[PDB]
Amino acid sequence: QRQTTKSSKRYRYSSFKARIDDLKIEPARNLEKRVHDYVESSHFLASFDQWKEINLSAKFTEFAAEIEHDVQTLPQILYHDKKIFNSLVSFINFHDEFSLQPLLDLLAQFCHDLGPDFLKFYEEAIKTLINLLDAAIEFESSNVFEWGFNCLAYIFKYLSKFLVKKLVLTCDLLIPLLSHSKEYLSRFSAEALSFLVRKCPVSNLREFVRSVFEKLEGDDEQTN
Amino acid sequence: VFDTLPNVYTKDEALVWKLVLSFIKLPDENQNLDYYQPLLEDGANKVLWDSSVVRLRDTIDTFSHIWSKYSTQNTSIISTTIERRGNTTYPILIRNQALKVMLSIPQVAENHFVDIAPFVYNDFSWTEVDRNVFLKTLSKFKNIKNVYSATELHDHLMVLLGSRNTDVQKLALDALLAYKNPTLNKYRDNLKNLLDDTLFKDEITTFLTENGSQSIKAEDEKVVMPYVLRIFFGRAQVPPTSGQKRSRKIAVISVLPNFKKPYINDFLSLASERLDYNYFFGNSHQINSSKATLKTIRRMTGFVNIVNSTLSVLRTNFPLHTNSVLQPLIYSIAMAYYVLDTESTEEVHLRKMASNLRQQGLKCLSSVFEFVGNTFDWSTSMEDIYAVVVKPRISHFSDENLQQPSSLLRLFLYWAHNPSLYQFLYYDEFATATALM
Amino acid sequence: ARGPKKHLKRLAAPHHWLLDKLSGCYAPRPSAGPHKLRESLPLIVFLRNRLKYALNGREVKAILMQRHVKVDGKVRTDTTYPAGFMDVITLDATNENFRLVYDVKGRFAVHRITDEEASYKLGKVKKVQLGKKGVPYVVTHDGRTIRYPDPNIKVNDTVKIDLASGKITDFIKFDAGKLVYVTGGRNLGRIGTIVHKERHDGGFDLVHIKDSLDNTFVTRLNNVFVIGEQGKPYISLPKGKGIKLS
Amino acid sequence: MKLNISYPVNGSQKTFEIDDEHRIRVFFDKRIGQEVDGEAVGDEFKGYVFKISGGNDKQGFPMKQGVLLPTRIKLLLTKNVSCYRPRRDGERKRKSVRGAIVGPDLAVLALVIVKKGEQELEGLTDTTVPKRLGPKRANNIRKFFGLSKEDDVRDFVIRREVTKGEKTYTKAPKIQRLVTPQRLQRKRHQRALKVRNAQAQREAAAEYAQLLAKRLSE
Amino acid sequence: GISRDSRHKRSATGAKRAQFRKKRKFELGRQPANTKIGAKRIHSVRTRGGNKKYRALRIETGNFSWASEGISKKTRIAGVVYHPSNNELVRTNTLTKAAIVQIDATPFRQWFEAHYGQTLGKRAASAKIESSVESQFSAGRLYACISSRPGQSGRCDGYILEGEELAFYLRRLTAKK
RNA sequence: GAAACUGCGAAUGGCUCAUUAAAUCAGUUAUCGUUUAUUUGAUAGUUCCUUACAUGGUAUAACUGUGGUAAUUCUAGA
RNA sequence: AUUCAUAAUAACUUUUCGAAUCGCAUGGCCUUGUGCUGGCGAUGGUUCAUUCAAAUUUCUGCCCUAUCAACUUUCGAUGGUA
């Protein structure tokens, strides 16, 4: 019996598990005036300025110092990609709740700008994401989960074609999240991979389904 | 049915009694449904697949269950046969049902009682509420002096008065006062008020202290002290957790020193009789059964604690008796040695309570020597008390006892300072003297 | 009046809150707590009137109930909590710590504070006694009871207190030549060194103090508060450093 | 007057108008809580036994047990009493209330049936009204159903079938004082927290005595 | 009806003050509880704060201490003997503080016999006690001063009158007889 | 989530200036002479001590139902 | 400045207190028992400290009246003791 006749009041309680069970993933199902989609001098820089004005936290302030010194223009991004990426990953691994919304948001936008060159960071980008998600389990924060899985969904959305072409490796990368022993990890990670698979065309889909069924025989004992 | 039956037992007051007794005996009585069990058949398999969606799981389960039953048809024939056969177990409360009926119609029990006294003299096992309702019946009896076994009932009834639950004590006084005699008629209210918790201490100092108004008289005291003694025994068994209850126990012991010598000795006899020592003293020093239970150990512990307080309150005037105080104390300390030697160190709780028992008993012996000492003989028991001194102690007395004056060492020193008691030093090859050396 | 009062007029407020005389008829009466009525700053007067992070009482209550404000490490949801002197109020979503300390003009000055300095708090040892079961305790100037103190901590001292554990990291004795902050009367906000302690038995001990420009004033022991040794304060002093000028 | 009679065992009740001063005189000068005879009252009540349980006089002032005056009095009524319900904490109103001894001036006399006679009263003894609510504590369910301590309650709760429109529906009360894994967890936690408290205190006290001894040995 | 303000009094100069304000509950009084000897009965008055206060209306027994060797025993109170405020209280057998009552001896003498190996009347250096106390024991009743406030704590506690105490009170009793 | 029980508030606020001439009040002290809801900080293993703690007991409200009176924020019996 | 804080002894008490309460969670362990452990916080509870208060109180200070010069003390006015 989930809350179905709303109380007249305005501030309810909504424990953690309630929030997560109410949580879903799709942003295109979602919609709003996205800043990066709005202004176009560069997507990363757009989000970067909005967040510098909005977020006042130690980690993001440090990160903003370093990078605002570096990036101001798309050629500068393209030239200094590695330094920016290492900085983002350094802070994400710092795992600070107050700074993660801007850091993950900037990561998604960083891929959006850098698309077909982002693949050389792709693998350990994903490693860092999954580490963050397990640590988030430790320090429960439904907001953290919302941000992290939306970063994954956005990365898939921006790198649709290449990931689709090399689909099965993505499934191998996500299988820790996919078979993870937590209902909502299974639920969300599968929703992201769901977007990607629905995008995929027929032939790679056949290869994918074969590979995943043989993985199922691999984890025959596992049910998750 | 409870509102009907008390009008028709009159029409039949024999079959109703038979049914009542049948139920009383009934739950303790064994019930068996050892039905016919055929040979087992291992016919079973994963007939269908296993899915996650719940209602599919459910229907698959129903089908698999039916399939399993049919594959193992034979035993399942038996099982379905049983379930349609139905039960024959009387619910366990049926004894309380019958007892409540018995309460409803007391005079029938007062009539027969022949099949009831076996329960009392077996001391029931039964549940506390059932015991209580049965004692309520016994209070409801009218001609109680003329029951089947009046005096054996009376003894068990005194024991129930000696019990510790104050409600059980109230019921036992109700029965013992259903027994009619003018002295207890005179002291009815006094005893009932003594049981009542609030008026307890005021009552003690009211009519128990000697040479006062409303004091008990001589013939009266002879006939009533056993009741008073059992009541005080329960009051003492109150365990001392709070300041108020500590004061309660202390008040009981501190009114003790005014009764009389035989009465005090009899009170201590109560303590020992709840305890036991004819094991050794029908043997010599050898335990018949390895009854090393916490049960008997805490029994001994309560006995020695009651004795320690008794000494501390009567420390020169109290009587000593070999068959009521001296011997059971010795049994206690001997048992402590025995258990401590016999069982390993895995039994922490037993071991700790045994050590505490040994401490308390030795302190008690030291005390009693200090406190009566020369005032009566020991020759009858010198050998035995020396024995229980010296089995474990003289071996390592010097090694163990050197930091503070121990109770045992104080015992030895009293022996030495008193001349007529040189007999222990004498009694061994001066093992005690050499230990001191 | 037949019981405690629950209201505070606006003219009757403590003056150092700088409350305008027309915006309303009532002022936030500070709830009972660590600091006395008249020398405390409630969280609404701090979050709305000083920080300007709010515009209403209902905005201030929204902030508190959303659980942002911690007064000495613990989360406070009472909107008239009497935050007092030498207090540490942290707003994490803004990444700020505030030591509440007096400005030269008398008023509470916001003092922005870093994390390693927000980690602790000074307290004026004010009553040393022997508690039940024989454990001795100190009572500081904001209610705090601290057991098992150093035996050499005497009344009128300072103890630097680790907030994360409610414990005493160390202390400072009330001797001549220490640095002194002043918290009452005409000179409050004035930091100087303690020259003399003229002590009267049965009356009020006065203290003679000398600020860095060698200007001397006389206050009461009730109003002296020892901060640190000469030239090194244990806390970070607000600007101007308690020098009254022309 | 009017006789408001009730059979508690069926819990039924009716009112009968009464006119004959003969049986009214049967009633006079008896008090609330005495006993009467249905024979002496009338023929239909043959063999019945009533106890005088209450009533109100012609102006509505009810009978109060305790006041032994067959008239009306002014009583300073206190918190936990009958014929008055306090409106406020610690409030005592002085109310007018009618005495206990029965007289003529009583308008409604209220009786309960103690011993059923030999004849059938129409609405009282024929019919009966079932209980509104069944047990709610664990042990009260157990007592109502005579259950053995082994058996669990949540299979024996009393549900109620209500219906709205076409959808039927069932209700069951929450069994207050049921023994639950949550309660076991809470008890376990209380014990652990006491242990932890005492250990912390002993550690601090040993540390302080350490500091003090070091000082005295300096 | 019992109130204890100082504004209904004449001033120090002997002036008379006109009433200043209605009487107040934070200066009330209450009816004295004349404690008498008999079966125990103790009302409990509720006092400012939530506190309690056990008025003793009748009290029989008591807790009395022998100071000289330092023990305490619960005894019975026989009757009031002397009272330094009202011989009327003595007449009416009213227990209050500072009263002199005759108490039962038996618990004390039993402790004495059992602790000092010697009877009373008819380590001996320690066993030696005062002549007057010995005489009272021979009689069976002791003189003891009630030293608590039965209207404030519902108790009669007391001490047994030793040397100078007892001398003074025996003179007072004998002179007043 | 109505009703009702339980907890809390209702002792504040607002209004008037009748009384009151060392009274009030003002500044200044004392409580080593006392109560204090609340807030805030600390703070309560007692292992044992002779014959359910997987958690005792009975009531009562609202409610169902029978009624009274010219009438009230009246209320009786079950 | 204390018969202070605090500690100790012996008793006493119609005698208190020493958690039978509630929310969200579902982790750790294994002798696989529906066993053993455990997280965040609501409420309450004794004794001190604090805070919001309160009650009493020290010193000094009031307008017109001497054609009001004696006042207060049974009926408390001043002091002592209980």
CA C11 vs CA C14, C20, C28: distances in Å: 8, 9, 12
Smallest CA-to-CA distance from B392 within B426, B347, B341 is with B341
The answer to whether residues D60 and D32 belong to one domain is: yes
The answer to whether residues D8 and D76 belong to one domain is: yes
Task: Return the CATH number at D208.
Answer: 1.20.5.2650
Q: How far apart are CA B64 and CA B58, in angstroms?
A: 10
Query: What is the number of domains present in chain E?
Result: 3
Is residue B325 exposed (0-12), middle (13-18) or buried (19+ Cβ within 10 Å)?
A: buried
The tokens for B47 are: 């007939």
**Alpha helices, H only, chain A:** 16-22, 35-38, 43-54, 58-70, 74-79, 81-94, 97-113, 119-138, 142-158, 160-165, 167-179, 183-199, 202-218
The answer to whether residues E134 and E146 belong to one domain is: no
Residue E158's domain spans which residues?
Answer: 31-105+141-177
Chain E interface, Cβ < 8 Å to B: 39-40, 60-61, 74-76, 104, 106-107, 110, 113-115, 117, 140
Q: How many CB atoms lie within 10 A of CB B178?
A: 16
- Residue B347 has φ and ψ, to the nearest 5°, of -80, 75
The answer to whether residues E92 and E39 belong to one domain is: yes
- Ordered by start, the domain boundaries in chain C are 1-116, 121-171, 174-244
Length of chain E, please? 177
Contacting residues of A for C92, CB less than 8 Å apart: 98
The tokens for D161 are: 């079938």
The answer to whether residues E86 and E43 belong to one domain is: yes
Please judge whether E113 and B317 are an interchain contact, meaning their C-beta atoms are less than 8 angstroms apart: yes
What one-character-per-residue DSSP string does B66-114 give?
A: HHHHHHTHHHHHHHHHHHHH---PPPTTHHHHHHHHHHHSHHHHHH--T
- Residue whose token pair is 């009282």: D124
The answer to whether residues D105 and D143 belong to one domain is: no
Q: How many CB atoms lie within 10 A of CB C177?
A: 11
Q: Within 7 A of a protein CB, which nucleotides of strand G? A: 5-7, 9-19, 21-26, 34, 36-41, 47-57, 71-73, 76-78, 81-82
B264 with B256: CB under 8 angstroms? yes
D157: left (phi over 0), alpha (psi -120 to 50) or beta: beta
Please judge whether D215 and C148 are an interchain contact, meaning their C-beta atoms are less than 8 angstroms apart: no
- Residue C213 has φ and ψ, to the nearest 5°, of -85, 20
Q: How far apart are CA A123 and CA A92, in angstroms?
A: 15
**Closest residue to F40 measured CA to C1′:** C33
- Minimal Cα–Cα distance from A98 to chain C, Å? 7
Closest nucleotide (CA of A15 to C1')? G24
**Closest residue to G55 measured CA to C1′:** E26
Residue D167's domain spans which residues?
Answer: 131-218
C1' of F45 to CA of C73 (Å): 30
Amino acid at A177: L
Coil vs helix vs strand at C78: coil
The tokens for E23 are: 């009487």
C1' of G57 to CA of C1 (Å): 20
C212 with C192: CB under 8 angstroms? yes
Q: How far apart are CA B294 and CA B354, in angstroms?
A: 9
Q: List the resolution, Å.
A: 3.8
Q: How many CB atoms lie within 10 A of CB C199?
A: 11
C1' of F18 to CA of E21 (Å): 12
C1' of F57 to CA of D57 (Å): 39
Sign of CA dihedral D190, D192, D195, D199: negative
The tokens for C28 are: 């936030």
The answer to whether residues E91 and E160 belong to one domain is: yes
Long-range contacts formed by D66-69: CB under 8 A, 24+ apart? D66/D100, D67/D97, D67/D99, D67/D100, D68/D31, D68/D99, D68/D100, D68/D101, D69/D99, D69/D100, D69/D101
Chain centroid, CA C183 distance in Å: 8
Amino acid at A221: E
Q: Does D203 touch chain C (CB under 8 A)?
A: no
Burial profile A100-109: b = 16 or more Cβ within 10 angstroms, e = fewer: bbbbbbbbbb
Q: How far apart are CA B126 and CA B116, in angstroms?
A: 14
Beta bridge partners of B324: none
Q: How far apart are CA B393 and CA B395, in angstroms?
A: 5
Q: Which of D101, D130, D159 is the last residue of a domain?
A: D130
The answer to whether residues D140 and D123 belong to one domain is: no
C200: left (phi over 0), alpha (psi -120 to 50) or beta: beta
- Minimal Cα–Cα distance from E155 to chain B, Å? 13
Please judge whether A58 and C92 are an interchain contact, meaning their C-beta atoms are less than 8 angstroms apart: no
- Minimal Cα–Cα distance from A99 to chain C, Å? 10
The answer to whether residues D88 and D193 belong to one domain is: no
Question: What technique was this entry resolved by?
Answer: cryo-EM
CA B333 vs CA A61, B297, B358, B360: distances in Å: 78, 10, 6, 9
Please judge whether C65 and A11 are an interchain contact, meaning their C-beta atoms are less than 8 angstroms apart: yes
The answer to whether residues D125 and D135 belong to one domain is: no
The answer to whether residues D58 and D35 belong to one domain is: yes
- Chain B touches chain D, with at least 3 Cβ pairs below 8 Å, answer yes
Q: Does D207 touch chain C (CB under 8 A)?
A: yes
The answer to whether residues D23 and D125 belong to one domain is: yes
Chain D interface, Cβ < 8 Å to B: 146, 148
Contacting residues of C for A56, CB less than 8 Å apart: 93-95
Domain C1-116 carries which CATH code?
3.10.290.10
The answer to whether residues D117 and D196 belong to one domain is: no
Please judge whether D146 and B91 are an interchain contact, meaning their C-beta atoms are less than 8 angstroms apart: yes
Smallest CA-to-CA distance from B47 within B78, B77, B69, B24 is with B69
Residues near C73 by Cβ (< 8 Å), separated by ≥ 6? C88, C90, C163, C164
- Minimal Cα–Cα distance from B91 to chain D, Å? 8
Q: Which of D86, D112, D130 is the last residue of a domain?
A: D130
- Chain A touches chain C, with at least 3 Cβ pairs below 8 Å, answer yes
The CA-to-CA distance between both ends of chain C, in Å, stands at 45
Of C148, C150, C151, the CB nearest to D204: C148
What one-character-per-residue DSSP string does B158-218 give?
A: HHHHHSS-HHHHHHHHHHHHHS--HHHHHTHHHHHHHHSSTTHHHHIIIIISSSSTT---H
Check for a shared fold between C1-116 and C121-171: no
Cβ-Cβ contacts under 8 Å between B and D: the total is: 5
Is residue E78 exposed (0-12), middle (13-18) or buried (19+ Cβ within 10 Å)?
A: middle
**DSSP strand E in chain C: where?**
41-42, 69-71, 74-75, 82-83, 87-91, 96-102, 108-113, 120-125, 127-130, 136-139, 145-147, 157-162, 167-172, 179-182, 192-198, 206-211, 215-220, 224-228
Q: CATH: 1.10.3720.10, 2.30.30.30, 1.10.1740.10, 3.40.710.10. Which one for C174-244?
A: 2.30.30.30
Q: How far apart are CA D64 and CA D30, in angstroms?
A: 14
Strands E52-59 and E35-37: parallel
**Alpha helices, H only, B287-420:** 294-314, 327-342, 348-371, 382-390, 393-400, 407-417
The tokens for E145 are: 């001063």
C85 with C143: CB under 8 angstroms? no
Q: Which of D130, D154, D183 is the last residue of a domain?
A: D130
The tokens for B198 are: 């609030």
Please judge whether A56 and C65 are an interchain contact, meaning their C-beta atoms are less than 8 angstroms apart: no
A203 with A209: CB under 8 angstroms? no
The tokens for E164 are: 């100078």
Beta bridge partners of C192: C180
The answer to whether residues E114 and E145 belong to one domain is: no
Contacting residues of B for E61, CB less than 8 Å apart: 201-202, 205-206
Length of chain D, please? 218
C1' of F75 to CA of D42 (Å): 30
E109 with E141: CB under 8 angstroms? no
Of B206, B258, B316, the CB nearest to E106: B258
Task: Return the CATH number at E114.
Answer: 1.10.168.20
CA C54 vs CA A118, B226, C84: distances in Å: 43, 83, 20
The answer to whether residues E66 and E148 belong to one domain is: yes
Touching D: C residues 112-151, CB under 8 Å: 135, 147-148, 150-151
The answer to whether residues E98 and E111 belong to one domain is: no
Please judge whether C93 and A98 are an interchain contact, meaning their C-beta atoms are less than 8 angstroms apart: yes
Q: How far apart are CA C151 and CA C149, in angstroms?
A: 6
Alpha-carbon Rg for chain E, nearest whole angstrom, is 21
**Domain C121-171 sits in CATH 2.40.50.740:** yes
Query: What is the number of domains present in chain D?
Result: 2
